[PDB]
Amino acid sequence: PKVSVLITVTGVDQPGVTATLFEVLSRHGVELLNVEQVVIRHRLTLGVLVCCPADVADGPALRHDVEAAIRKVGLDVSIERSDDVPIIREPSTHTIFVLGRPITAAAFGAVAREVAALGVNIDLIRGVSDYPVIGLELRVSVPPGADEALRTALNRVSSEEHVDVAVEDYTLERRAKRLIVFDVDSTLVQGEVIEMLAAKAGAEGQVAAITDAAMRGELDFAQSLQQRVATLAGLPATVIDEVAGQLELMPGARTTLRTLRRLGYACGVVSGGFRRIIEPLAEELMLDYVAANELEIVDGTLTGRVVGPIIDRAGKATALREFAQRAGVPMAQTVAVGDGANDIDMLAAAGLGIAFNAKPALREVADASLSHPYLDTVLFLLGVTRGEIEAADAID
Amino acid sequence: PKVSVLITVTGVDQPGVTATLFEVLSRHGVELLNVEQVVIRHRLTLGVLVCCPADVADGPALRHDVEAAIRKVGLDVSIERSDDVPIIREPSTHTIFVLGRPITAAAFGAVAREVAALGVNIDLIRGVSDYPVIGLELRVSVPPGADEALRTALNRVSSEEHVDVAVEDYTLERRAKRLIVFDVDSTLVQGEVIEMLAAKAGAEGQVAAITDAAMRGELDFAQSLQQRVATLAGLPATVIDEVAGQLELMPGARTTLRTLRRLGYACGVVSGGFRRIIEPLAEELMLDYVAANELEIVDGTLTGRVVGPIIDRAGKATALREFAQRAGVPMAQTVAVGDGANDIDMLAAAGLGIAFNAKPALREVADASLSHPYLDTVLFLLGVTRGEIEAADAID
Numbered sequence: 001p002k003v004s005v006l007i008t009v010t011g012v013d014q015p016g017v018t019a020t021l022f023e024v025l026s027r028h029g030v031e032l033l034n035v036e037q038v039v040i041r042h043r044l045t046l047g048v049l050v051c052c053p054a055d056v057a058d059g060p061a062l063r064h065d066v067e068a069a070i071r072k073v074g075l076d077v078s079i080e081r082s083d084d085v086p087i088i089r090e091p092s093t094h095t096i097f098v099l100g101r102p103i104t105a106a107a108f109g110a111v112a113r114e115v116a117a118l119g120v121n122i123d124l125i126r127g128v129s130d131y132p133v134i135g136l137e138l139r140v141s142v143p144p145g146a147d148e149a150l151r152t153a154l155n156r157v158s159s160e161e162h163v164d165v166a167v168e169d170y171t172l173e174r175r176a177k178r179l180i181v182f183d184v185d186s187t188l189v190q191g192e193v194i195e196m197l198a199a200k201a202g203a204e205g206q207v208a209a210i211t212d213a214a215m216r217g218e219l220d221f222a223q224s225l226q227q228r229v230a231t232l233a234g235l236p237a238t239v240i241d242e243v244a245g246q247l248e249l250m251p252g253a254r255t256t257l258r259t260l261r262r263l264g265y266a267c268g269v270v271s272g273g274f275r276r277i278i279e280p281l282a283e284e285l286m287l288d289y290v291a292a293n294e295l296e297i298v299d300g301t302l303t304g305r306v307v308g309p310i311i312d313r314a315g316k317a318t319a320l321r322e323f324a325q326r327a328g329v330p331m332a333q334t335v336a337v338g339d340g341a342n343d344i345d346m347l348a349a350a351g352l353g354i355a356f357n358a359k360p361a362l363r364e365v366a367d368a369s370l371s372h373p374y375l376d377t378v379l380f381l382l383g384v385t386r387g388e389i390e391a392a393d394a395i396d
Numbered sequence: 397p398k399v400s401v402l403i404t405v406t407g408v409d410q411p412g413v414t415a416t417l418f419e420v421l422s423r424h425g426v427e428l429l430n431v432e433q434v435v436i437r438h439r440l441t442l443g444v445l446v447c448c449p450a451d452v453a454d455g456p457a458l459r460h461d462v463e464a465a466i467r468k469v470g471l472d473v474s475i476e477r478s479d480d481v482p483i484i485r486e487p488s489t490h491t492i493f494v495l496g497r498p499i500t501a502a503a504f505g506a507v508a509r510e511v512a513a514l515g516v517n518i519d520l521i522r523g524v525s526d527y528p529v530i531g532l533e534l535r536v537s538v539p540p541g542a543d544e545a546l547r548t549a550l551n552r553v554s555s556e557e558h559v560d561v562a563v564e565d566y567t568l569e570r571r572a573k574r575l576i577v578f579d580v581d582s583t584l585v586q587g588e589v590i591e592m593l594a595a596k597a598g599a600e601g602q603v604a605a606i607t608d609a610a611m612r613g614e615l616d617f618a619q620s621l622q623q624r625v626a627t628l629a630g631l632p633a634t635v636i637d638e639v640a641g642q643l644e645l646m647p648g649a650r651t652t653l654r655t656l657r658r659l660g661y662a663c664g665v666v667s668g669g670f671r672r673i674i675e676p677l678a679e680e681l682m683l684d685y686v687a688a689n690e691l692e693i694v695d696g697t698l699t700g701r702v703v704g705p706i707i708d709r710a711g712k713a714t715a716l717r718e719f720a721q722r723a724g725v726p727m728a729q730t731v732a733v734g735d736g737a738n739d740i741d742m743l744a745a746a747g748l749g750i751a752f753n754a755k756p757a758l759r760e761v762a763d764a765s766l767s768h769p770y771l772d773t774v775l776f777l778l779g780v781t782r783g784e785i786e787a788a789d790a791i792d
């Protein structure tokens with residue numbers, strides 16, 4: 001066909017507009033080059049880029065057939081001989097997630113302003129969740145180089161306006177992630193296992209103070225581990241099982257793992273805690289990988305020491321490479337989720353680093369930060385919508 | 397906030413509408429429940445479902461602020477106190493791909509009609525490719541049970557109107573595919589290796605007739621293999637290397653594999669051809685898995701026989717399970733692409749079975765069929781757009 005024509009239908013959605021418009025076009029020389037349609041709050045837009053003979057493009061018959069059929073039923077229709085108009089839009093360069101409880105218009109306006117300031121175009125906005133948190137997504141086209149500046153703006157917006165705001169590369173490659181590791185304490189699991197253990201010794205006070213200092217980047221993680229575990233010296237090893245039984249998963253943890261299994265993720269945990277507690281849950285949760293420290297035991301009693309290599313800050317990164325090597329997943333397809341400075345190296349080595357209700361030391365280095373006590377908000381940052389979770393869960 | 401209000405902006409896109417609308421809303425009690433926006437051919441729709449005090453929802457101030465700001469700059473705006481309106485649309489149940497060269501308005505209208513007949517709602521239409529073939533996608537919501545009837549309608553439409561039309565489940569699970577196997581002859585590779593070999597014996601005629609019969613489901617694959625390879629009796633084994641060098645990849649084959657490596661796919665080939673030819677290319681293409689038959693050789697000469705287990709129709713399925721077992725991928729996340737009846741069991745065992753320029757016997761059983769001599773149209777059926785391929789390829 002000689003030339004291109006653009007036909008744009010808009011108005012209040014009605015049954016059968018799509019079919020009707022393409023019957024009409026078939027009565028002319030028409031081949032489709034591109035078609036985009038959506039209905040947002042009963043507003044229909046139907047954009048049809050079309051290929052027909054110069055004979056048909058500049059004759060009133062085509063226009064009149066379309067104009068009569070569309071207007072008859074209560075819609076509007078445009079018909080312009082394009083020729084120089086793009087055929088198919090280009091993909092977004094990035095996607096921006098906004099989670100809040102709530103998201104104020106002010107918060108969202110600040111995001112939109114920071115975006116529009118940097119020359120970043122908004123290609124689509126959709127809601128990804130109404131529960132447990134309101135989640136919104138902006139697919140954007142970021143001018144080359146503004147990548148860095150935009151993340152900073154949105155980090156300022158995030159904290160000023162009390163929403164989480166994460167900017168992810170929306171490329172083919174960086175999207176097909178396949179491996180996720182969770183920190184255990186205060187990430188996959190509520191609270192600190194060492195504090196639960198330290199309680200059985202009447203040491204929960206000192207132990208929680210040191211844990212706070214260690215997780216904030218105030219103290220070396222190795223020394224802090226040795227000082228806190230030392231408070232357990234003399235407890236029967238029976239206490240490991242008991243503390244194990246007290247563990248409460250992070251809200252949405254189960255939803256998070258189930259959903260990630262549906263997507264084919266390899267899943268593991270990497271903690272400075274204790275393999276003898278973590279392994280029960282690792283099994284229950286059908287996890288693929290567990291790296292953890294080890295309590296020393298003598299005649300069935302704890303000594304106050306841990307064994308062998310201490311999984312320290314650097315050791316958490318090392319474990320994620322082990323995992324991603326054993327799993328044949330390139331580091332750029334890996335996800336790490338943590339809450340403490342214990343985790344800075346893990347997150348930084350991972351393709352996507354997610355700080356989860358995390359001390360300032362980790363937020364400052366993370367790729368994205370989540371502020372709400374639901375681990376399944378991790379899913380939203382992995383391109384999953386609430387409705388998709390609910391639909392797949394319903395099927396079962 | 398007490399009650400929900402719906403604010404719908406529409407009209408000709410302009411810079412800064414998004415930001416402006418949310419500044420205005422921030423001057424009231426407004427929290428966002430849902431936001432959807434898109435621009436199709438310079439037509440903007442912005443749909444904002446919002447949460448504000450009953451004080452603010454039924455007062456003219458909110459309405460007047462919005463109405464004045466939006467209309468000033470040349471757009472229209474609706475404001476209706478919803479309350480009972482859905483917050484976030486539900487996900488599509490299926491997606492429908494339409495590829496043609498060309499796609500007539502008639503072809504597309506037939507699809508739209510077959511869809512609308514079954515009660516299937518259209519949620520989005522976007523173009524996924526302008527090259528090498530025009531590709532369109534319909535995300536749809538299919539009433540429970542109509543799954544089967546809709547695939548048949550669209551198969552009738554496909555052949556009557558000369559477009560490929562594939563209906564895929566658009567669930568979380570069935571989307572995260574991770575393993576693809578290709579048949580070699582007339583799928584990944586142009587032509588039939590056995591015909592190239594049979595030529596060196598002056599037997600290409602008989603050999604191509606039998607291959608046609610075997611690939612159409614006319615003859616048992618085992619007997620057809622034995623009859624055709626027998627025509628090679630007496631050729632020097634040197635001929636394997638020569639035929640190897642003559643091989644032309646299917647157009648778009650390289651693009652297909654490169655793109656699938658970007659998505660983290662495990663990739664292999666499963667052929668009734670000959671490991672000594674296929675292995676050179678399997679290596680060149682950095683493939684993960686090769687199952688193939690084996691030419692018998694004696695004093696450096698071929699005997700006319702193949703060795704060991706013949707990979708027959710059932711043996712091609714067996715190999716895909718081997719591959720998907722070695723790869724820890726559930727069969728429902730597997731993709732098989734083939735052209736002949738040789739392939740019926742492979743395709744049927746795979747999560748997605750793709751017949752590629754295939755004899756009628758295979759199209760009849762396939763999950764989807766492709767009719768154009770470009771193997772990268774396989775990508776479009778795997779949720780990849782042309783623009784995404786081009787963008788990632790550009791990066792390098």
Ligand SMILES: O=C(NO)Nc1ccc(Cl)cc1Cl
Nearest residue numbers: 185186192194272273339340
């Ligand atoms: O993961 C943690 N907080 O997020 N804390 C932590 C827990 C148990 C142990 Cl043994 C050591 C530490 Cl540093």
Ligand SMILES: O=C(NO)Nc1ccc(Cl)cc1Cl
Nearest residue numbers: 581582588590668669735736
């Ligand atoms: O894959 C094929 N056609 O699509 N053909 C074929 C090729 C080589 C051999 Cl040895 C046997 C067969 Cl049946």
Ligand SMILES: [Cl-]
Nearest residue numbers: 274275276295
């Ligand atoms: Cl332990």
Ligand SMILES: [Cl-]
Nearest residue numbers: 670671672691
């Ligand atoms: Cl061989």
Ligand SMILES: [Mg+2]
Nearest residue numbers: 183185186340
């Ligand atoms: Mg932790």
Ligand SMILES: [Mg+2]
Nearest residue numbers: 579581582736
């Ligand atoms: Mg073949």
